[PDB]
Amino acid sequence: SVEIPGGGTEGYHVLRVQENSPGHRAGLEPFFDFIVSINGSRLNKDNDTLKDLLKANVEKPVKMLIYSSKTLELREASVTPSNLWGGQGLLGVSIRFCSFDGANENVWHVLEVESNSPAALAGLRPHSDYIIGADTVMNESEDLFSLIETHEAKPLKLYVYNTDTDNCREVIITPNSAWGGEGSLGCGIGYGYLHRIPTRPFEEGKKISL
């Protein structure tokens, strides 16, 4: 169950969606979305195709193919690139060409947070926060614990999903092993089974047995 219309696992990883932007009214959201094709044109190579297509279809309805690492679904959207909405960009997004293979498995589940911890100072929320990624200069050697190491005592920008708001946000944290306590975060982290982005659920207030 994958279906990648055109082949491959590369695409445009969405990083920012300006409010009231065509990208926004199209239903794009940061970090979970990859633009995979636009107007029949599959974006599986790092070039100008997207820019160029955006500009040839200015003020004209177009179809877009979005993969989501939240749901693992493809979805079709319609977008009208524009100069009329007020903001910079015909789309109004920041993006980056890269792979979405296994992106749903690169998540870290924030558990308990010790007070005065670097996790606390960063605003990490116990249980409802999921670190789903990070911004590196050179978009390079990912993996949370590796980053936490290479960023000892340095400012580090994380992408976090929250279950309560169902929203993502950017969080600056400074891993600091000299914080008084154990570790460099001051918080528990769960990874793996039961610690991936929660699914839904369909049916609210259905009856269960436990």
Binding site listing for Zn(2+): 13, 98
Fold held by 1-105: Pdz3 Domain (2.30.42)
Which residue type sits at 154?
K
Asked whether 4 and 23 are in contact (CB, 8 A), the reply is no
Asked whether 180 and 120 are in contact (CB, 8 A), the reply is no
User: Which residues 6+ apart lie within 8 Å of 78 measured at CB?
Assistant: 26, 61, 62, 63, 64
Buried b (16+ CB within 10 A) or exposed e, 171-204: bebebbbebeeebbbbbebeeeeeebeeeeeeee
> CB pairs under 8 A, 24+ apart, for 145-150?
148/175, 148/184, 148/185, 149/184
Which residue type sits at 56?
A
The experimental resolution of this structure, in angstroms, equals 2.7
Return the residue matching tokens 């633009």. 35
Q: Where are the beta strands (DSSP E) in the chain?
A: 10-17, 33-38, 41-42, 62-68, 74-79, 93-99, 108-113, 129-135, 156-162, 167-173, 187-190
Domain boundaries, the chain: 1-105, 106-210
Q: Considering only the top CATH level, what class is 106-210?
A: mainly beta
Binding site listing: 13, 98
